[PDB]
Design a binder for these strands. Structure first.
Length: 703
DNA sequence: CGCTGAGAATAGAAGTAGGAGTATGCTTGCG
């Protein structure tokens, strides 16, 4: 229908994107922030846009995210106690007299409005089943843990319950359903979390494995809502996703029967499990890469899956009770019109003889996974379809189709090697240096300026990349100490190579104190580095490793790597910061499009630069600029964050594109901060001949 | 202290129901 005028829709410190032909819009705020008061708006029939209520508000804003308070914690206490918690605010748990603690007892408010770790529980053994516990933000009704006794979970107002709201103590000692969590609107899952939580609970860990039966079979059904952003560009993204899924599942030594269904308003059936080539994984891949477009109706798709399941024999066929069925549904809408599709799932469970017995519940033989995309997905409908298994997650909500691609890219990258550059598998029990293995702390002691706390990046087994200003020639080799993997041992240096075109003494008798052009250095370690779960390399530009990370053909020029890593835009980069021995990822944006000159124009204020006529004499083509308050409130760098990598996070891999060099104003531990507070980084594409010459013998396969 | 038969309300029909609703969830005016 008609559209609305976009005058005044912008949000303080955020951006927006129009969905469904402009009749809707989502607000996107920087990390750690959320749009206040609401995330989405609709186009009225009166020209204007939806109003903002909390109580009508003038204009939207981005405000900091708070982590919920534990509504209660049975058989123990937690502290510090507060009504709400800011980001990066840990809380500890203690259990009462004679109780036993399980779960993470030192949780922490992550940058995503969620608590780090998992649910703390105090239990003794005075019940048949275990203490199901109270996930933070929920409310459990019922405290008796005898057989068949129930417990129910409730979410606060304005929040949506993902998981089970009723768990019954089954015969056994394990609870039914799955642990619930409360979901706010803007809450998205990261591709890392989705990949891990899908792989686990698709598999069991011996590496992993898929547990079929003796003379067992698996039937997998890929259902795609191609009536919106999923079926765009002829399902181009969803094709990659499913190709990598088929590959990764074939890697586990199983030959499953595949089925493939798209649906806009009608279900279109491409691959049926009865076709003899339905277990030929590459036949399925060839037929999948062959799908085409062309109101969303899901019940018909689930009934097509049911027709695949059903049999026309007299009565049953052979091995019906040995086959395990998996239904992977990817949607971005799912306003369940055309009927109520839950009945279809219950008919399916009927047909599989699931939940019709006490010693044979057969819940292992049906898995339903749902991947929701975008803000317009119904958090309740997707959760009602998905399954609920103890210690397993089956519902996911991601923000783009790009993130859904990165999910399966990350899943494929899982078991390549420890030498895969820029690879981080986000685990269940991970510390700081688990998530930034390339980091290297340089310490240089000399009380003329001061304990220079410089970071670094492990680009290979013998080399570490940093910034040249960290060192001088007065600094002698018994004063530079490099540490990796966040250990206590310092490493041994052969030589520290500075760029041949580096000179901080400028341009000194021209009236400029420091000239940071070509401010890169390479530390050659004497010994070798032992790649592990805490020491791993980072990807560099214009190497075939980055070409394989960016999922590109081997005939890719360094210029194409540039135009994908550094286009003329507001590229979303990141870096890592020292914060009380905490390693946190600060996320910034590189002003390389139309804001580039506005960024370089804010160099004037930096020390000794307030009278330089030409600002391009201190800010040279070997610099990228981040910081400021446009288009988002960027975080600035610290004095000790100097030399660290400026990372671009793409296709679930981390590519280094810059070296942190200098900043306009040092405001590090802060938060009224100026808008001319920018940071400059050395572009690693501009110092490429030096890097290639110096790392020629490190197996980086430079382009 | 009684009718409300028409509108509001983050959209917004049109019934009339102390309805409903993707983050929530109602009242006009008449002694």
């Amino acid at each position: 229908q008609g559209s609305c005028s976009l005058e005044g829709v912008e949000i303080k410190g955020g951006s927006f994107r129009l969905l469904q032909e402009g009749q809707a819009l989502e607000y996107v705020c920087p990390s750690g922030f959320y749009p206040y008061p609401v995330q989405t708006r609709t186009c009225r029939s009166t020209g204007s846009w939806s109003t903002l209520k909390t109580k009508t508000v003038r204009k939207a804003e981005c405000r900091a995210i708070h982590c919920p308070r534990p509504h209660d914690f049975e058989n123990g206490e937690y502290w510090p106690r507060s009504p709400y918690y800011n980001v990066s605010d840990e809380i500890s748990f203690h259990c009462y007299d004679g109780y036993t603690l399980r779960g993470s007892a030192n949780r922490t408010c992550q940058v995503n409005g969620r608590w780090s770790g998992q649910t703390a529980i105090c239990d003794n053994g005075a019940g048949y089943c275990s203490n199901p516990g109270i996930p933070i933000g929920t409310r459990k009704v019922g405290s008796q843990y005898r057989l068949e006794d129930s417990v129910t979970y409730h979410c606060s107002r304005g929040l949506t319950l993902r998981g089970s709201q009723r768990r019954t103590c089954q015969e056994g000692g394990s609870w039914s359903g799955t642990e619930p969590s409360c979901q706010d609107s803007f809450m998205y899952d990261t591709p890392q979390e989705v990949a891990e939580a899908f792989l686990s609970s698709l598999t069991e860990t011996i590496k992993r494995k898929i547990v079929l039966d003796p003379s067992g079979s698996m039937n997998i059904y890929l259902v795609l809502d191609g009536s919106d952003s999923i079926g765009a560009s002829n399902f181009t993204g969803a094709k990659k996703c499913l190709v990598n899924l088929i590959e990764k599942v074939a890697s586990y030594g199983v030959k499953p029967r595949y089925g493939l269904v798209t649906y806009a308003t009608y279900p279109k059936i491409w691959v049926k499990v009865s076709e003899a080539d339905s277990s030929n994984a590459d036949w399925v891949t060839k037929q999948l890469n062959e799908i085409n477009y062309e109101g969303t109706n899901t019940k018909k798709a689930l009934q097509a899956v049911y027709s695949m399941m059903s049999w026309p024999d007299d009565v049953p066929p052979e091995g019906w009770n040995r086959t395990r069925h998996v239904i992977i549904l990817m949607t971005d809408g799912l306003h369940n019109m055309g009927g109520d599709p839950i009945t279809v799932i219950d008919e399916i469970r009927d047909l599989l003889y699931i939940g019709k017995d006490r010693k044979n519940p057969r819940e292992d033989y049906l898995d339903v996974y749902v991947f929701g995309v975008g803000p317009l997905v119904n958090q309740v409908n997707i959760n009602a379809l998905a399954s609920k298994k103890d210690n397993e997650q089956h519902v996911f909500k991601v923000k783009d189709m790009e993130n859904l691609e990165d999910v399966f890219y990350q899943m494929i990258d899982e078991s390549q090697s420890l030498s895969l550059c820029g690879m981080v598998w986000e685990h269940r029990k991970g510390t700081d240096y688990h998530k930034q293995p390339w980091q290297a702390k340089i310490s240089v002691i000399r009380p003329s300026k001061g304990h220079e706390s410089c970071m670094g990046a492990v680009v290979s087994e013998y080399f570490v990349l940093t910034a040249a200003h960290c060192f001088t020639v007065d600094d002698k080799e018994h004063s530079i100490k490099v540490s990796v993997g966040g250990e206590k041992r310092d490493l041994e240096i052969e030589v520290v190579l500075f760029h041949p075109n580096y000179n901080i003494n400028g341009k000194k008798e021209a009236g400029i104190p420091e000239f940071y052009d070509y401010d890169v250095a390479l530390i050659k370690l004497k010994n070798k580095l032992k790649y592990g779960q805490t020491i791993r390399p980072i990807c560099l530009p214009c190497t075939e490793g980055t070409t394989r990370a960016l999922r590109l053909p081997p005939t890719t020029t360094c210029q194409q790597q540039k135009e994908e890593l550094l286009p003329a835009q507001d590229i979303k980069a990141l870096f890592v910061s020292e914060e009380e021995k905490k390693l946190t990822r600060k996320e910034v944006y590189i002003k390389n499009g139309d804001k580039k000159g506005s960024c370089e124009r804010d160099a004037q204020y930096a020390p000794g630069y307030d009278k330089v006529k030409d600002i391009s004499e201190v800010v040279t083509p070997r610099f990228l600029c981040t910081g400021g308050v446009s288009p988002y409130a960027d975080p600035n760098t610290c004095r000790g964050d100097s030399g660290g990598p400026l990372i671009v996070h793409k296709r679930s891999r981390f590519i280094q594109v810059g070296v942190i060099s200098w900043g306009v104003v040092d405001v590090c531990k802060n938060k009224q901060v100026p808008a001319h507070a920018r940071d400059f980084h050395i572009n690693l594409f501009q110092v490429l001949p030096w890097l290639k010459e110096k790392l020629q013998d490190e197996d980086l396969g430079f382009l």
